[PDB]
Amino acid sequence: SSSFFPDFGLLLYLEELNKEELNTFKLFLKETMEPEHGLTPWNEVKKARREDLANLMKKYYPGEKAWSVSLKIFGKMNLKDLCERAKEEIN
Amino acid sequence: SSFFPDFGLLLYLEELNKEELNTFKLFLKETMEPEHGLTPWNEVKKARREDLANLMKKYYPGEKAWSVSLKIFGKMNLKDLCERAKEEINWSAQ
């Protein structure tokens, strides 16, 4: 098997995130989780510190799911960066 | 209606600077390989923003384009973060 993302990857990249980006990460996670987990696991995520957040991902999204979901979240965060940046270019 | 494929993909693809676009194509090359090989690569590499958007709709119609685009943009974000951590972990690599 492979792609031990939550244990060896995720925590490093979450740490590289600033406070705002980390919240944005949590926000996009809430979006992908709610339709399937509702807002029940949400409270843990918002207050979850980076290492706690990594554990949560491993819990709810086992196997390569954590990697796939993370990539999509990082993608949207990137789109948000681009949208905000384009919005900056328009003004 | 499909907003992402017709106007979405092209819009943010348009927001990419020259270097960011090359990284995008490179990640696309990586994503297309398992089924299309390096056959469409020569076309993708030189394709301007409008042509590139058209190519993806061809190979990835419907929600195919969205999933592929999101992951490509994600890999781009990770690459930026990876480069930064790499310098923070080791002050002598660049």
UniProtKB/Swiss-Prot annotation, chain B:
Give all residue intervals belonging to the Pyrin domain: 1-91
- Which tissues and organs express this gene's product? Testis-specific.
Q: Where in the cell is it found?
A: Cytoplasm
| Family to which this protein belongs | Belongs to the NLRP family.
- Give the comment on domains: Upon heterologous expression, a small proportion of the isolated Pyrin domain forms homodimers and higher oligomers.
What's the stated role of this polypeptide? May be involved in inflammation and spermatogenesis.
Q: What is this protein called?
A: NACHT, LRR and PYD domains-containing protein 14
Q: Which span of the parent protein is shown here? A: 7 to 100 of 1093
